[PDB]
Write a protein that binds this ligand. Structure first.
Ligand SMILES: Nc1nc2c(ncn2[C@@H]2O[C@H](COP(=O)(O)CP(=O)(O)OP(=O)(O)O)[C@@H](O)[C@H]2O)c(=O)[nH]1
Ligand SMILES: Nc1nc2c(ncn2[C@@H]2O[C@H](COP(=O)(O)CP(=O)(O)OP(=O)(O)O)[C@@H](O)[C@H]2O)c(=O)[nH]1
Ligand SMILES: Nc1nc2c(ncn2[C@@H]2O[C@H](COP(=O)(O)OP(=O)(O)OP(=O)(O)O)[C@@H](O)[C@H]2O)c(=O)[nH]1
Ligand SMILES: Nc1nc2c(ncn2[C@@H]2O[C@H](COP(=O)(O)OP(=O)(O)OP(=O)(O)O)[C@@H](O)[C@H]2O)c(=O)[nH]1
Ligand SMILES: [Mg+2]
Ligand SMILES: [Mg+2]
Ligand SMILES: [Mg+2]
Ligand SMILES: [Mg+2]
Lengths: 426, 428, 428, 426
C-alpha cells in the first residue's frame, strides 16, 4: 500500500519539487506541513505518500538526492521544501558533473550507501509497500548514473515491489552533455533489466504542447514539470482514491507489459488546451479521447501511429459513464485498428477513478506502449556509435575506470530492444 | 430457510450495495438495522436490528471503505466487512493463488460463523465478475472450499459477462478462461449479464444516454430481488432457491442461464401504455430486452424460467405461455419439453426511489439457457488465442507460478464446453 | 463458607486490584468499605464496612504503595498491606529463599489471623506469575507453609503463563522450572493465562490495538469473578470452590486447567448480534478465544468445566452440550467421559464502567485440561536447556545458595510431567 | 533501598555535576536545596538519593572526590553545588597528575581513608542500601587510580551491595595522557574483579551522536554529560518510581550477567533526534526500538552487530502497552537473530516504568552486553604492549613503586577478558 519516491539529479530534484507540491494540493496539505484540508478523502489515503509526524505534520515519503548542496538548498528554500525533513536530503559535495562514471561507478557510488540506509529506514516506516518510484534524467550523471546504482540495490532488496521510474529522455534537439547519449546508453544497459517500467519524457515535445495547444509563450521548466506531475499524480491517485475500475498500480503494470523486456511508456494528457478555447470546448468522454489519442498531446517525442500499439491505458478522473467510456474506447480501437497489434484482442484497457483533479471536471491520462519508442533508441544508438568510435569525453569516463567493452555491450543491448520491438512490430 | 450472499470484488460489492439497499427498501429497514417489521436473509438482534447475512470481500480497502463510510455502514456488521491491503491486479494468479489465498481462511471462517448462525441453510449465491482478479480469481478459490463444506447447499453464481467490445482488462480472456476451468467444475449455476447490452436497455427502454454503474446495478438489483426477496415472500407458486436450481440446471455441466427482464420502462413510457402479463412476457422473448449481447434467435432453448411479481393471474400466464410456445420462433432442443418454471408471487415489484424505472404493477423475470452461449465462448477463444499465441502479458502470471500447459488446458476445457453445446444443439 | 485471596508480586497485586474493584462493583462497595448491601469474601465491621479477606504481598514498597495511595486504600486494612524493602530480582533464589523467607512469617501470621476470622474456611487462592521472583519464588514458599496449616483447604493457584515470545525476564525459564518442582507437589490446581493470547483477544474481539495491563487484568477479573462472586451467589446449580476442585482435578499431579472466556465483545460488536447460550459456548471451543497460546486442536481434553452467568436456561445448555460433544472435533481422552461441570448461576455477568467489554446478558467461562500443555513445557525445556547448557546467569542463583543438581532435577521433574501427559494421551 | 554515589576525577566530578542536576530536576528540588515540586512521587521515593536535612533540605547522597581544590570549587560554585554539603567534598592538594601510581598506589591512597570514613557515615545514614555507584574515567589518575582503590575497600565492607560504575573509556582518537591505556589496563586489572558491573562510555561516539542525530554544532562536555546522565538517571528512576515491570537494579544486574567476569555494558538512548525532525517523528514503541537498536545511538564506540549479543535490556519510561513492547522486542530478537547468542533463549529482556522523563512522552534506555566490547580491550591491550616495552612514563610509575610484573599480569587479565568473550562468542 505505500510508495517511496526518490528524486535525483538537478532535473529529478526540480521535477519532484512540482510533484510533491501537487500531491499536497490534492490532499490540502500546507507548505509548512500541516493538514488543512477539507475532505475526508484527503486524509484517508494519505499514507501512501505521507507519514504523519507528531503534531499533524506530514512527511513526504521521499528522498532528495544530489551531489551539490546548492540545488538541494534551492529546493528547500521554497514552499514544500519545509515539509521535507532534513533527513531526506542526502547529498555530497562535489558534483558528478554529469558523469556516469562518477555517479555510478565511482564517486556517487560512495554516497549511495547513505541514501540506501535512509531508504531502509523508510521501508520500515511503511506498513506495506506497493512500490517505489524514481525521478530522473537519462543522460545525467546523478540522475541516471547514481540513480541507476540505487535502483539496482533497491530492487535487490525488494524484488517484490514495483520499481518504476520516469525519466527525461534526451530530446533530439537539446542535449546538454556531449555524451548525453552515452550516459543514456549506459542507463539502458542498466535500467531496463533492473526496472519494471520506465516512462519517456521529451522536453521538446513538451515545449511544443505548451505552445501548440496551451498557446503559452513563457514556460519554464516548472510549468513543463507541472505537466509531468499531472501524469504522475494522475496515476497514483487513483490508486489512492475510490473509483470504479481497477485501481492498482501493479495491475496497471501487468496490463501494460506483454513481454519482460519491453516496458517503455509514452505518457499523454487530457484535457490540455488554452483558455480561449475553453469557452468553446465541450466536456465529454469523446472529447477526452480525442485529446488522448492525438499524438500531439503526447509528452514523448514519438509517433504512435508510426509504430504499432502494443498496449494502451486510459485512466479517467471524475464522473463518467461506464457505457460512454467503453464505447469510445471501442471506437478508438476500431478506427485506429491499423495501429494496434493483432495479437492482443481489445488492446485498449481502462481504469476509472471518481475523483477529478482539482479545478477540473474531468481528466484523462494516456499511457502507451508502442513500437514507435524504438525510434528514440535508434537515434541514441547511432549517435552513440559515432562518439564511441571517437571516445569523446571517454577519457573522462575511462579515466574513472569505465571500460569500453561494457559500453560495447550497452550498445548491443540498445539494439536488442529495437530488435525486440521489431520482433513484435511484425 | 436461510441463505448467504457473497460479494467479491468491486463488482460484487457495488452490486451488493444496490441489492441490500433494495432489501431495505423491501421492508423499510433503517440504515442502522432497525427494522420495524424477512428473516431468511436477516439475522435479528434484541434491538430489532437485523443483519444481512452476507460477506463482503475486497482485497483493496477502498470499496469496503466506501461501504464503511456510507449509510449502510451501520447495517453491516464490521466482521462482514473484510478487507485485505493489496490487489490481485486483474489476475487470477494472485487472486486465486498468491494473494487471495492468504486471506480466504478468514473469509471462510466468517462464512462458517454465519453458517452456524443459519438454522436451515438453504444455500448461497456469489456476486462477482468474470474478468477481474478478485472478481474471478478469488471467487473460484472460494468455491473450491465452499463446495467441500457446503456440498449440498445451493451454489449459485452471478457474474458480469465480459463485454465483447469494452473491456478494461487486457488479460480478461485469460482470467475468464481460467475461471471456466475452475468454476464449471465446482459451481452449480452461473448467471451473467452484459453491461453493453444493459446500456442499450437503458437508452432504449429507460431513454437514458448517461448510464453509470450505479444505474446499471439498480437494474441488476431488480432482477436479483425478484429471485431473492420475492421468492421468499408469499405467492401462489412459492419457488425456492433450491427449486430454482432443481428447475434450471439440466446437466451437470454448467450451465449458464442468461437473464432477461421485462418491464424496464421509463416513467413516461409507462404512461399511455397498459401492460398485461402476456405483453410483458412477449417483451421477455424479444432480443431487445436480452441482458447479454447474444442473439436469442441464433441458438436453441434448453431452459426457461419465468418469475412473476405483483398482479399476475395464472390464468393469464397460461394463455401467455401457450402463445410463446406456439407463436414464437423460439426453437428449442428436443430434449426439452417446454416445462418452463412459473413462479408466481403475489409480492409486488418494487422500485428504487429516485430510480429510472417506472412503478409497475406486475413484472416478469426470465432465465434462459440457449445454445448461442457457445458463441460467447468463441469470442473468448479467439481473444485468448491471440494473446496466448503471442504470449502477451504471460509473464504476469508465470511470475506468480502459473503454468503454460494449464492455460492451454483451460482453453481446451472451454473448447470441450463448446463442444457440449454443439452436442445439445444436435437434436436428437 | 469463606475464602482468602492472596496477591503476591506485582502481577498478583495488580490483578487483585482489578479483582477487588470488581467485587466492589458487584455489590456497590464504597472505597471506604461502606457497603450498603457477600460475606464470604468480606468481613464486617460495626460501621458496615467490609474488609476483603485477602493478603497483599510485595517485597518492594512501590506497588503496595500504589494501593495505599489509591481509592481502595480505605478499603484495605493496613495489616493486609504487607511490604518488604527489597526485591527478589527475578529470582527464586531470593524470592523463595534469601529474602522472601524472612518476611513470610509475618505474612503467614496475617493469613492465620484471617483464618481465625474465618468460621468456615473453604479455602483460598493465590494470584501470581510464573516468572517472577516473588511472583513465583515467594509464592511457592508460601505454599510450603499453607499446605501444612491448611492441608485440607482449597489450594488454587492462578498464574500468568510466560509468553513464548515476550518475556522481560531472562531467567524466567529457570524460575518457572523451579516452581514446577515445588508447586506441583504442593498445590492442588494451577490455572494460567497468556498475555500474548489475550492481546489477540483484545485486538480481535474487543478491537483494541492498545492493551495495557490495566485492560488485560480487567478481562482476567471477569473470569475470576465468574468463579468467585458468582459461585457464591445464587443459581440453579450452585457450585462451590471445593466442588471446583473436586470437579476439575483428575489426577494428583497437577493439573493445569486453562482458561477460555466467551463473551469477549466490544460494544459495537454486540450490536447487531444475538448470542445464545449455545452460541457463546460455540465460541468457547474456538481456538480464537483461547486465553493461552496453545492449540486446543493439538491436544486431547481431559477436563472441561463450563460456568454460566445470567440468562441461561439448562434446557439450552443441554442442547449446547450435545452439540459440543458430537459436533466438534474435540478429541478427548478415554478416561473421561464427558462429565463436564455445568455451573449455572442466575447471577448476571457484570461489566466494569469505562471498560471495553459490552454489557452482556449471559456469559460462559470455560476451564480445560488439554494434553497440548506438554508443548508449553517443551518450550520451557529448551529455553531452560539453552541457558543451563551455557550456564548463563547461573551465578545469580548460585550465589544465593542454589545447587546445579537441583536445577537439573527440577528440569527432570518437568520432563516427568511431560511424560505423564504423554501417558494420558495414550489412550487406553 | 538507597544508593550512594561517588564521583572522582575531573571527568567524574563534571559528570556528576550534571547527574545530580537531573535528579533534582526529576524531583523538583531547587539548586539551593529545598523541595519545590509538585508531585507526590517527587518526594515519595526521594530517599534513595537524598537525605532530608532539617528545614526540608535535601542532601545528595554522594561524595565528591579530587586532589585539587579548584575543580571542587568550580563544582561548588554552580547551582547544585550549594546543595552538596561541605562534608561531601573530600580532597587533597596536590593533584595526582593523572598518575595511577599516585592515585592508587601512593598519594591518593592517603586521602582514601578520609573518604571512606565519610562513606561509612553515610552508610549508617541509610536505612538499607541497595548499592553504590561511581563515576569516573578509566585512564585517569584519580578517576581510575584513586577511585579503584576506594572501590576495593567499599566492596570489602559491603559484599552484599551493588557495586557498579560508569566510566569514560579512552576513545580511539582522543587520549590525553600518554599512558592513558596504561591506567586503563591497570584499572581493568583491579576493577573487573572488584565490581559487579561497568559501563563503557566513549566520548568520540558521543560527539558523533550529537551531530549525527542531534545535529548540534556546539557541544561541550556538559551537553554530552547530559546524555550520560540521561542513561544513568534512566536506570535509577524506575527503581524509584512506580511501573509495570521489574524495577530493581539488582534484578537488572542478575539478568544482564551470564558469567562472573563479563560485565561490561554498552549504553544507548532513545528518542534522540533534532528538533527539525521532531515535527516529522511519530512516537511509538517501534520508534523507540528503532532508535535503541541502532548502533549509531549507542554511546559506546562499539558495534554490536560485529559481536554477538549476550544480553539486552530495554527500559521504558512512560505509558506504553505491554503488548506492543513485547511484540516489538520479539521482532527485534527475530530480525536480529544473527547477532544474538543461541544459548540464551529470548535474550532480550524488558523493564517498564510509567514515569516519563521530564518533557518527553516516552523514552528508552538501551543496555547491552555484547562480545563487541572486547574490541575496545584489544585496542587498549595492543597500545599498552607497545608502551610497556618502552616504559613510557613508567619511570613516573615505577618511581612511585609500581612494579612491571603487576602490569604484566594486568595485560594478561585484559587478554583474558577478550578470550572469555571469544569463549562465549563462539
Ligand atoms: N523536463 C526537465 N529536464 C531537465 C531539467 N533539468 C535538467 N533537465 C534535463 O536533464 C539532463 C541534465 O541533467 P541534470 O540537471 O539532472 C544532471 P544531474 O544534476 O542528475 O547530475 P550531474 O552530472 O551531477 O549534474 C538534461 O536532458 C537536461 O536537459 C528540468 O528541470 N526539467
Ligand atoms: N565525557 C567526559 N570525559 C572527560 C571529562 N573530563 C575528562 N574526561 C576524560 O577523562 C580522562 C582524563 O581524566 P580527568 O579529568 O578525570 C583525571 P582525574 O582529574 O580523575 O585525575 P588526575 O590525574 O589527578 O588529574 C580522559 O579520557 C578525559 O579525556 C568530561 O568532562 N567529560
Ligand atoms: N455491472 C457492473 N459491472 C461492473 C461494476 N464495476 C466493475 N464492473 C465490470 O467488472 C469488470 C471490472 O473488474 P475490476 O473492477 O477491474 O476488478 P475486480 O473484479 O473488482 O477485482 P481486481 O482486478 O483485483 O480489482 C469490468 O468488466 C467492468 O466493466 C459495477 O459496479 N457494475
Ligand atoms: N496479566 C498481567 N501480567 C503481568 C502484569 N504485570 C506483570 N505481568 C507479567 O508477569 C511477569 C512480570 O513479573 P515481574 O513484574 O517482573 O515480577 P514480580 O513477579 O512482580 O516479582 P519480582 O521479580 O521480584 O519483581 C511478566 O511475564 C509480565 O508480562 C499485570 O499487571 N498483568
Ligand atoms: Mg547537477
Ligand atoms: Mg477492485
Ligand atoms: Mg515487582
Ligand atoms: Mg584532575
Amino acid at each position: 500500500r505505500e510508495i517511496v519516491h526518490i528524486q535525483a539529479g538537478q532535473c529529478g530534484n526540480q521535477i519532484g519539487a512540482k510533484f510533491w507540491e501537487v500531491i499536497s494540493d490534492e490532499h490540502g496539505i500546507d507548505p509548512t506541513g500541516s493538514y488543512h484540508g477539507d475532505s475526508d478523502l484527503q486524509l484517508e489515503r494519505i499514507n501512501v505518500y505521507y507519514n504523519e509526524a507528531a503534531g499533524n505534520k506530514y512527511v513526504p515519503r521521499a528522498i532528495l538526492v544530489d551531489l551539490e548542496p546548492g540545488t538541494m538548498d534551492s529546493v528547500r528554500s521554497g514552499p514544500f521544501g519545509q515539509i521535507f525533513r532534513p533527513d531526506n536530503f542526502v547529498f555530497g559535495q562535489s558534483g558528478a558533473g554529469n558523469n556516469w562514471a562518477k555517479g555510478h561507478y565511482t564517486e556517487g557510488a560512495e554516497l549511495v550507501d547513505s541514501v540506501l540506509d535512509v531508504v531502509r529506514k523508510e521501508s520500515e516506516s511503511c506498513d506495506c509497500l506497493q512500490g517505489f518510484q524514481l525521478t530522473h534524467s537519462l543522460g545525467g550523471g546523478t540522475g541516471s548514473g547514481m540513480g541507476t546504482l540505487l535502483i539496482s540495490k533497491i530492487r535487490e532488496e525488494y524484488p517484490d515491489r514495483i520499481m518504476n521510474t520516469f525519466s527525461v529522455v534526451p530530446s533530439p534537439k537539446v542535449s546538454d552533455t556531449v555524451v548525453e547519449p552515452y550516459n543514456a546508453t549506459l542507463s539502458v544497459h542498466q535500467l531496463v533489466e533492473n526496472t519494471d517500467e520506465t516512462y519517456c519524457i521529451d522536453n521538446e515535445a513538451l515545449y511544443d504542447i505548451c505552445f501548440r495547444t496551451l498557446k503559452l509563450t513563457t514556460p519554464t521548466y516548472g510549468d513543463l514539470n507541472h505537466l509531468v506531475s499531472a501524469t504522475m499524480s494522475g496515476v497514483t491517485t487513483c490508486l489512492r482514491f475510490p473509483g470504479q475500475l481497477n485501481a492498482d498500480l501493479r495491475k496497471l503494470a501487468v496490463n501494460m507489459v506483454p513481454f519482460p523486456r519491453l516496458h517503455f511508456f509514452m505518457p499523454g494528457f487530457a484535457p490540455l488546451t488554452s483558455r480561449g478555447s475553453q469557452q468553446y470546448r465541450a466536456l465529454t468522454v469523446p472529447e477526452l479521447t480525442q485529446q488522448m489519442f492525438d499524438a500531439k498531446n503526447m509528452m514523448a517525442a514519438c509517433d504512435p501511429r508510426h509504430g504499432r500499439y502494443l498496449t494502451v491505458a486510459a485512466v479517467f478522473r471524475g464522473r463518467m459513464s461506464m457505457k460512454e467510456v467503453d464505447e469510445q474506447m471501442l471506437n478508438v480501437q476500431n478506427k485506429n485498428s491499423s495501429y494496434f497489434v493483432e495479437w492482443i484482442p481489445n488492446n485498449v484497457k481502462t481504469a476509472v477513478c471518481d475523483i477529478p483533479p482539482r479545478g477540473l471536471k474531468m481528466s484523462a491520462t494516456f499511457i502507451g506502449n508502442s513500437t514507435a519508442i524504438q525510434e528514440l533508441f535508434k537515434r541514441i544508438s547511432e549517435q552513440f556509435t559515432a562518439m564511441f568510435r571517437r571516445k569523446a569525453f571517454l577519457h573522462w569516463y575511462t579515466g574513472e575506470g569505465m571500460d569500453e567493452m561494457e559500453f560495447t555491450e550497452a550498445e548491443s543491448n540498445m539494439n536488442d530492444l529495437v530488435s525486440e520491438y521489431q520482433q513484435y512490430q511484425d | 430457510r436461510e441463505c448467504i450472499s457473497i460479494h467479491v470484488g468491486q463488482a460484487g460489492v457495488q452490486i451488493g450495495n444496490a441489492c441490500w439497499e433494495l432489501y431495505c427498501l423491501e421492508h423499510g429497514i433503517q440504515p442502522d438495522g432497525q427494522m420495524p417489521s424477512f428473516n431468511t436473509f436477516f439475522s435479528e438482534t434484541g434491538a430489532g436490528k437485523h443483519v444481512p447475512r452476507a460477506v463482503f470481500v475486497d482485497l483493496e480497502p477502498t470499496v469496503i471503505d466506501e461501504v464503511r463510510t456510507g449509510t449502510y455502514r451501520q447495517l453491516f456488521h464490521p466482521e462482514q466487512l473484510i478487507t485485505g491491503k493489496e490487489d490481485a491486479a486483474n489476475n487470477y494468479a494472485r487472486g486465486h493463488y498468491t494473494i487471495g489465498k492468504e486471506i480466504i481462511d478468514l473469509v471462510l471462517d466468517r462464512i462458517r460463523k454465519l453458517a452456524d448462525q443459519c438454522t436451515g441453510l438453504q444455500g448461497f449465491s456469489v456476486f462477482h465478475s468474470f474478468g477481474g482478479g478478485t472478481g474471478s480469481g478469488f471467487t473460484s478459490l472460494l468455491m473450491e472450499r465452499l463446495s467441500v463444506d457446503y456440498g449440498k447447499k445451493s451454489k449459485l453464481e452471478f457474474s458480469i459477462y465480459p463485454a465483447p467490445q469494452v473491456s478494461t482488462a487486457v488479460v480478461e480472456p485469460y482470467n475468464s478462461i481460467l475461471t471456466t476451468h475452475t468454476t464449471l467444475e465446482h459451481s452449480d449455476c452461473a448467471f451473467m449479464v452484459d453491461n453493453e447490452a444493459i446500456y442499450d436497455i437503458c437508452r432504449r427502454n429507460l431513454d437514458i444516454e448517461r448510464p453509470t454503474y450505479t444505474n446499471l446495478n439498480r437494474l441488476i438489483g431488480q432482477i436479483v430481488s425478484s429471485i431473492t426477496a420475492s421468492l421468499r415472500f408469499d405467492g401462489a407458486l412459492n419457488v425456492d432457491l433450491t427449486e430454482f436450481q432443481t428447475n434450471l440446471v439440466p446437466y451437470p455441466r454448467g450451465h449458464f442461464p442468461l437473464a432477461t427482464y421485462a418491464p424496464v420502462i421509463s416513467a413516461e413510457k409507462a404512461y399511455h401504455e397498459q401492460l398485461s402479463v402476456a405483453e410483458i412476457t412477449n417483451a421477455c422473448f424479444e432480443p431487445a430486452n436480452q441482458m447479454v449481447k447474444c442473439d436469442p434467435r441464433h441458438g436453441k432453448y434448453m431452459a426457461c424460467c419465468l418469475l412473476y411479481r405483483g398482479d399476475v393471474v395464472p390464468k393469464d400466464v397460461n394463455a401467455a405461455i401457450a402463445t410463446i410456445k406456439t407463436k414464437r420462433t423460439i426453437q428449442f432442443v428436443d430434449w426439452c419439453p417446454t416445462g418452463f418454471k412459473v413462479g408466481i408471487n403475489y409480492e409486488p415489484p418494487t422500485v428504487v426511489p429516485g430510480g429510472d424505472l417506472a412503478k409497475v404493477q406486475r413484472a416478469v423475470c426470465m432465465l434462459s439457457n440457449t445454445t448461442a452461449i457457445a458463441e460467447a465462448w468463441a469470442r473468448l477463444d479467439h481473444k485468448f488465442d491471440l494473446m496466448y499465441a503471442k504470449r502477451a502479458f504471460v509473464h504476469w502470471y508465470v511470475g506468480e507460478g502459473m503454468e503454460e500447459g494449464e492455460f492451454s488446458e483451460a482453453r481446451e476445457d472451454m473448447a470441450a464446453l463448446e463442444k457440449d453445446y454443439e452436442e445439445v444443439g444436435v437434436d436428437s
